[PDB]
Amino acid sequence: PPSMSITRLFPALLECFGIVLCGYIAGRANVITSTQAKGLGNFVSRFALPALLFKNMVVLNFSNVDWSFLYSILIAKASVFFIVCVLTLLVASPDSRFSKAGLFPIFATQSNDFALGYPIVEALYQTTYPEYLQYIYLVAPISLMMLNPIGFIFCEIQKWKDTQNASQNKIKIVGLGLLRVLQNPIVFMVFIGIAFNFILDRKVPVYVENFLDGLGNSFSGSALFYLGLTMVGKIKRLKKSAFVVLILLITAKLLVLPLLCREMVELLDKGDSVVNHTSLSNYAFLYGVFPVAPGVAIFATQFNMEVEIITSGMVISTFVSAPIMYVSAWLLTFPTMDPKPLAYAIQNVSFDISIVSLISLIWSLAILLLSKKYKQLPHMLTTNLLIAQSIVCAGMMIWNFVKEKNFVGQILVFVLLYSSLYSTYLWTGLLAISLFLLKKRERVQIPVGIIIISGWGIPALLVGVLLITGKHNGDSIDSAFFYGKEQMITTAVTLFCSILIAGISLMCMNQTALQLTRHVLLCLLLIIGLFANLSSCLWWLFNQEPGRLYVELQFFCAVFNFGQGFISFGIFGLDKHL
Amino acid sequence: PPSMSITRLFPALLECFGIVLCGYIAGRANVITSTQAKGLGNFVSRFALPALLFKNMVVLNFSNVDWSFLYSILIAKASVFFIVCVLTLLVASPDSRFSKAGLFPIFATQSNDFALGYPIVEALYQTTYPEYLQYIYLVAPISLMMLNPIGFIFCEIQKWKDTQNASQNKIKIVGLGLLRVLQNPIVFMVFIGIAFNFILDRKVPVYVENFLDGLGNSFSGSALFYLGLTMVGKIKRLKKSAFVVLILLITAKLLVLPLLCREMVELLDKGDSVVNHTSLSNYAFLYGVFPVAPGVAIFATQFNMEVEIITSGMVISTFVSAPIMYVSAWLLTFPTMDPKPLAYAIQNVSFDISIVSLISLIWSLAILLLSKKYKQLPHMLTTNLLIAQSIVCAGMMIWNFVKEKNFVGQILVFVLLYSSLYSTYLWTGLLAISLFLLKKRERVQIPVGIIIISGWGIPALLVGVLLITGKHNGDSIDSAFFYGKEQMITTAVTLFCSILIAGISLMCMNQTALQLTRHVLLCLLLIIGLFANLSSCLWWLFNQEPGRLYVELQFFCAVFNFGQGFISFGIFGLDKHL
């Protein structure tokens, strides 16, 4: 029982974010401006989406719906809404506690299901369990109807605050929130679909079937395109602790909502089939991983309260959720399997990450080279770092196709890939040390040539030492055990020395105190990658038996080792002016 | 060998024009204005259409292409282009002979294939002959490449005329036309698809397959929606003989191009299979019936020459082609079949026309009633006419479901339907006589009440006479032979008296000489309907054996009898101000 067509998930994550990338490219170039994107959004939100919802609620089978999963998923969302509203009510400022308490729990519970979740669920669940596709169209509008009025009451209280007549008349406000919920196209189109499911007896009329198919099949691509068009220039800057609350909200939505969904599904679904329960638990975890829908930013726009935070949160959560679906789904499918074909799964995941990392690295390198900022510090060491990560990805490109052909080509590919990887490891520390030296503003001529010589020679010297002294393992198909324990000891020493050098330089920068505003976080986000890289090397030497936690840590080593170009591109390449 | 899934053609004609109607409604209301429709068109023409063409040219099988059909279809288009260019060069005015000679043959040869032709061909030809769907993507870009440069040379000569330096340098102009052809997205996307068909060996890569499917499946609905958005307010008014040349161009494109396509396919396809030849001939006729693409109006816009005529021609040809596909395809499938189930085909066609006629009549009646113009002449008799045609359509609605239930209900339905039909027949003449009386501007108090009494009583008296004197035919399932020869004699006398009364009034109006500008043509277009109605009644009495020409004439009787509400709605209901 595979219960997940996980082979065909990466093409789905390529479609759903390639159309978003196309919309973003068309928005920033200047092909479709904001006003014309408003017309495309008018088409999508008023013609394609109601036809999709109406068709899929007409043909829906209410006899075969496992309701236990449905109200378990809703109990999870209700708990998330309740806790986020509770601490947003306690800790926020009195002049804006009600707007935040009405918009943040809406932000932390409303997934982007009809645009992004439906193609991903369709790819993972058409050929194995086709009945899970209807739960999107069942759960998302019920979640809207049962969670949005509570938030809208608070935002209408905040709108009441400015006027301030102490009118009372609670009907006037809570019925206003309720009718705002009912005027949403999803809600009354699901009501109409529920009525016509019983009127027409679960069958769309033949004269109307093709019209509804033509309007519903145009929702996916145009909706993803309009979502990509929505993100142009909306990230803005922020303020201290607004960064922190943005981290907390996106962390809540993408982390504690899926674990609550899994826990309440494992608590409330009491079926007699274990494999069905396991597939329901995995699908419940996958459902919460979907990003925040743009309807929350629309709601904050019509209320005209906290528009910057919610818009930044949606455009940040959509990007951030893109690797989280892949990593989470491959972590869910790692139970059972088999010991030895797990290595091919790890290799396939690293290959699929390296494709996107190489393309984004080519983009960021082209932007940095054409803008002529590569000659000025500190961007020269960054250019060296991105070149090294490109050699890492190209080494995986070679290594996937040459592991079973020749020993000499495999040895050369391993030497090049680990030289580039170790160079990236110490290049993070070299960039941090250069940032600490430039932050002191002293008259010290920084030897950038000597730094580049060290960054190109020390990993090469380590690779040569591992080639001269290490013993080749012919039965090892994974890259992490090419020379056995000698290679892992060399990677552990390089990671520990680089993290300690970068950690001292990062702590010295705060005590001594674009450019430095983003540079630090790109240095910061790699240290979490190097910390997870160091722990798996420590886990292998001290423990003889590799457990399942070692499997998860090796997978995280693959993502934070081979997707560093993605993080670098998100920080550096996606930026204007240059 | 049916060779046409003609049962499922009307849902396809409902989808392809319902999305166009949705786009038109959204454009005129004010939901999506012109500027925002430009952004939706930017998405459709730059992202969805190139992905559709690139995918369908990647997976195309060049081993199984019957090339004989392809260059027969191209020879037909070349002949149409040659003759239209020849007489446009002879008869046009010298100051604008080159612009017309370069834009009119482009107008008369460029079908709307990727938006409208592809779903209709998909419905008619997926389950029977699936290999005909690739001929759209093969023929339309080759037709573009082989016909557009000849026109573009003439339009660039007209652009040269205003500057007038007598530069010569024929390379400078014909290469400009050629590069304008190559910069069209269809042409170089078909070139790239041709290259990648041989590079990738006819298979789209798996990482790119879902992305291309997501962008290509969004072309149909959004393209039809943008086509509907394009038509808002573009019909304008016209000038004498511009009406005539518009009739000639749309007549050429929708009439003589399909007969030339059939004749050259029957002349050039010399295969050894008769049924394949017949299906190819029918598909070749169906291919030319597609309306003019909006790219011709785009081309006239970028040239900024004859924009009004070409825009009016495209928005007129798209509406006019909507019944022509249905009538033409049912005329093509009428060979062979069987004698007696031909009556069910006729009944099904009349039912499918009556659905659209009833909905459009409800719209036009609501517009005429709410605008309060029904109380003033001549619109009162028009309101009576549309009410009578609504009773005709509702009588067919009753008659389809009550022909095999009870004799009394069938008799009542036949009496009501033929009373309303005969009332429509003489109401055309009454409207013409009232127009002739109002055109005289004399002080004659027109008895509108007596006219309404005559229009409601004379058809009722004819129905009562046919009930009292006629003999019921129990073996007749068609409506035209309910009382045998007595009913057809009564319909012939009513049609001959009405055409003679309206013909005298129409000829007297021209000799004596919105409002009268459109009123006459709605009176004019019904006379062609009454003339075709009269000839089939004359054909049945004088000829004992019903031939195939009688079958075609009875079918035309059904369309011009039961779709008069469509013509009335197109003239009256689709109008502003009111």
Ligand SMILES: CCCCCCCC/C=C\CCCCCCCC(=O)O[C@@H](COC(=O)CCCCCCCCCCCCCCC)COP(=O)([O-])OCC[N+](C)(C)C
């Ligand atoms: C793996 C592959 C998956 C498939 C992908 C397929 C390929 C598709 C790839 C990508 C698709 C995503 C959309 C494409 C277009 C981008 C638009 C966008 O939203 O950009 C936003 C940028 O966003 C940021 O600036 C956020 C930075 C996040 C980087 C760090 C996150 C690490 C994720 C891992 C952590 C967990 C690791 C795992 C642990 C479990 C908004 O852009 P903007 O508003 O224009 O702002 C920029 C300009 N300005 C700054 C000058 C104003």
Ligand SMILES: CCCCCCCC/C=C\CCCCCCCC(=O)O[C@@H](COC(=O)CCCCCCCCCCCCCCC)COP(=O)([O-])OCC[N+](C)(C)C
């Ligand atoms: C059978 C059922 C098929 C399926 C249909 C499914 C249902 C879908 C139905 C219809 C779909 C069509 C599009 C819907 C929206 C209309 C938009 C449009 O183009 O309107 C245009 C109007 O056009 C006219 O004014 C033309 C008048 C033609 C009427 C006579 C043709 C008779 C056809 C039979 C002859 C052959 C008989 C057969 C012999 C072989 C442009 O509109 P506008 O620019 O806004 O101008 C109006 C306003 N203004 C005047 C004030 C400026």
Ligand SMILES: CC(C)CCC[C@@H](C)[C@H]1CC[C@H]2[C@@H]3CC=C4C[C@@H](O)CC[C@]4(C)[C@H]3CC[C@]12C
């Ligand atoms: C488990 C996940 C979902 C929670 C943490 C996700 C991380 C990677 C997200 C959440 C908060 C996000 C950051 C917070 C806000 C900004 C400010 C802006 O100027 C650039 C993007 C940037 C720097 C975001 C980058 C990505 C980010 C750090």
Ligand SMILES: CC(C)CCC[C@@H](C)[C@H]1CC[C@H]2[C@@H]3CC=C4C[C@@H](O)CC[C@]4(C)[C@H]3CC[C@]12C
């Ligand atoms: C066989 C077919 C394709 C050829 C003739 C089609 C007929 C029905 C078409 C072609 C020319 C068209 C007319 C010519 C131009 C106008 C002027 C405009 O103010 C209203 C529409 C109207 C009145 C068109 C109505 C439909 C029309 C009469």
Ligand SMILES: *[C@@H]1O[C@H](CO)[C@@H](O)[C@H](O)[C@H]1NC(C)=O
């Ligand atoms: C889930 O449902 C039942 C048990 O509840 C059983 O047929 C099997 O475990 C699963 N069936 C399907 C069709 O998923």
Ligand SMILES: *[C@@H]1O[C@H](CO)[C@@H](O)[C@H](O)[C@H]1NC(C)=O
């Ligand atoms: C058309 O092709 C051949 C004859 O050329 C024959 O198999 C049959 O008539 C048709 N076949 C198909 C698959 O349409």
